């Protein structure tokens, strides 16, 4: 966990259920984001499904994905075959895809979720990500 930072995105998480979950990655480090995985012994209603979004500060703040912000990942598979549905991100300065996204060293970035079943439209989950600067990664 020196290049690759992992996080499992399910309501039953003690860092998220707080509200200030936040992390420190470096330029060229990854961010694996594992959805809520469910054994076939889960009755559909108790299966968490979300829709990940990459937004800014405001977007991070008022849990609002309508104004501005990307839609980056999607946990519609609570029943994925080989372990949990993975959604990865690399914090590299520069990206050769219109698709992809770029990451500045010593800015911070923000991610937020809204359940696919839609459940209680007011609060929600959220990660903050600070980028250690050019030379504070060691």
């Amino acid at each position: 966990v020196a290049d690759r930072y992992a996080v499992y995105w399910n309501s039953s998480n003690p860092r998220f259920q707080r509200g200030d979950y936040h992390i420190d990655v470096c330029i060229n480090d990854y961010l694996d984001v594992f959805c809520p995985h469910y054994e076939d012994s889960v009755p559909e209603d108790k299966t968490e499904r979300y829709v990940l979004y990459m937004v800014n500060f405001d977007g991070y703040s008022a849990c609002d994905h309508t104004s501005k912000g990307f839609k980056r990942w999607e946990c519609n598979r609570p029943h994925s075959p080989n372990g949990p549905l993975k959604f990865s991100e690399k914090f590299q300065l520069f990206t050769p895809f219109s698709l992809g996204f770029e990451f500045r060293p010593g800015r911070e970035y923000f991610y937020i979720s809204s359940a696919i079943p839609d459940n209680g439209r007011r609060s929600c989950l959220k990660l903050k990500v600070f980028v250690r600067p050019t030379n504070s990664c060691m």
Partner: protein
């Protein structure tokens, strides 16, 4: 038709090919697109100057293929749309290849490769195709031959550029299994040289064959067939149908080896069964030794319709009309005979002492003139209408008359 050795595209991003050097070079991203999930193998060390970033496809088993067809899809980003912009970057990378007889696993060897082309973009993603989120995608293509060894590798070189491998897709080429004119042709594999014409012996479908020219086909490098030489014909009793060869209906036939269908049974002829060579003849009708079995059923000719004998002067002119039933033919030959019933009474055939103006038997005319005669005689005469089938008959057919001169 094409046969595929590889499609990183549709591998739902689970292939993961060896990178080099040890993960500091090429990298794999996921990403949304058209709402569906897609993965790419990208690099972007424009800055780090001295490069050499390889990315090496697994191990493709050769198979039958001898010239393989590589087809990469990819976006390349522009070098002026970089803000820092350290101008050691580019938009050209390198395609390679390795023949091996044994997956070297995750052993890797640069020198071991030879290079195909330096692929480059037909569309640079520039600082604007970003703001909009515009996807400047490249389809470029190449291939190489011919491939001798068990199995081969691709692999890519990056000298510092902002590339991003969307699709690798490898496939080769065979010419479709084919029915073309009563010969069957394999499905069979193209080949390496550029004017390489596959020569493929055809084989004749059920019921058909070669008259002398051979059935043959020509298979190109693009997996196409080309110079139809020859054919096969629906044989003795069968008629070509579609690309089949169906038998001759109820009451038809086909005698020889022909491009022609089934001629319906002629006349005087019994409603043949299924697929009859020559048509079956009716009781009371015939055919000759030099006859076609198309030339219907015939019978010997009825006797001249009309007989007379004009005793014109001293020489009797013979004059007779042609038969009322030809026997459906046009090949009748009149044969004529003679006698001497003298009154006296003793009857008895002529003497060659008499003279004519034409030979006795086989007459394509209806008249002659008998000079050299004996005044006073029930001079009996008889002409006969005979054709060609007039030998499958003892039962004669003739007509007769008599004359006496003075």
């Amino acid at each position: 038709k094409e046969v595929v050795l590889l499609d990183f595209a549709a591998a739902g991003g689970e292939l993961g090919w060896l990178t080099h050097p040890y993960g500091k070079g090429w990298d794999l991203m996921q990403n949304i697109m058209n709402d569906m999930p897609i993965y790419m193998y990208s690099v972007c060390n424009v800055m780090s100057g001295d490069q050499d970033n390889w990315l090496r496809t697994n191990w493709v088993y050769r198979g039958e293929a001898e010239r393989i067809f590589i087809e990469l899809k990819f976006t390349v980003r522009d070098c002026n749309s970089f803000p820092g912009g350290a101008s050691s970057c580019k938009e050209t990378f390198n395609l390679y290849y390795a023949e091996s007889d044994l997956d070297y696993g995750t052993n890797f060897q640069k020198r071991l490769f030879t290079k195909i082309d330096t692929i480059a973009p037909d569309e640079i993603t520039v600082s604007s195709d970003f703001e909009a989120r515009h996807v400047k995608l490249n389809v470029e293509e190449r291939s190489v031959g011919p491939l001798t060894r068990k199995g081969f590798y691709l692999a890519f070189q990056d000298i510092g550029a902002c590339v991003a491998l969307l699709s690798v897709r490898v496939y080769y080429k065979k010419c479709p299994e084919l029915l073309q004119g009563l010969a069957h042709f394999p499905e069979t594999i193209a080949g390496s040289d550029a004017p390489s014409l596959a020569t493929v012996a055809g084989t004749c479908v059920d019921h058909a064959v070669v008259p002398p020219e051979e059935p043959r086909m020509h298979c190109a490098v693009d997996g196409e067939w080309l110079v139809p030489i020859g054919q096969c014909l629906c044989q003795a009793g069968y008629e070509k149908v579609e690309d089949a060869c169906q038998a001759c209906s109820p009451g038809f036939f086909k005698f020889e080896a022909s491009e022609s269908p089934c001629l319906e049974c002629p006349e005087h002829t019994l409603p043949s069964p299924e697929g009859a060579t020559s048509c079956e003849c009716e009781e009371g009708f015939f055919r000759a030794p030099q006859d076609p079995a198309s030339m219907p059923c015939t019978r010997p000719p009825s006797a001249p319709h009309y007989l007379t004998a004009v005793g014109m002067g001293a020489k009797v002119e013979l004059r007779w009309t042609p038969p009322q039933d030809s026997g459906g033919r046009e090949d009748i030959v009149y044969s004529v005979t003679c006698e001497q019933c003298w009154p006296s009474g003793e009857c008895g055939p002529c003497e060659a002492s008499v003279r004519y103006s034409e030979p006795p038997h086989g007459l394509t005319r209806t008249s002659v003139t008998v000079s050299d005669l004996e005044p006073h005689m029930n001079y009996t005469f008889t002409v006969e209408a005979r054709n060609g089938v007039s030998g499958l008959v003892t039962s004669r057919s003739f007509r007769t008359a008599s004359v006496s001169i003075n």
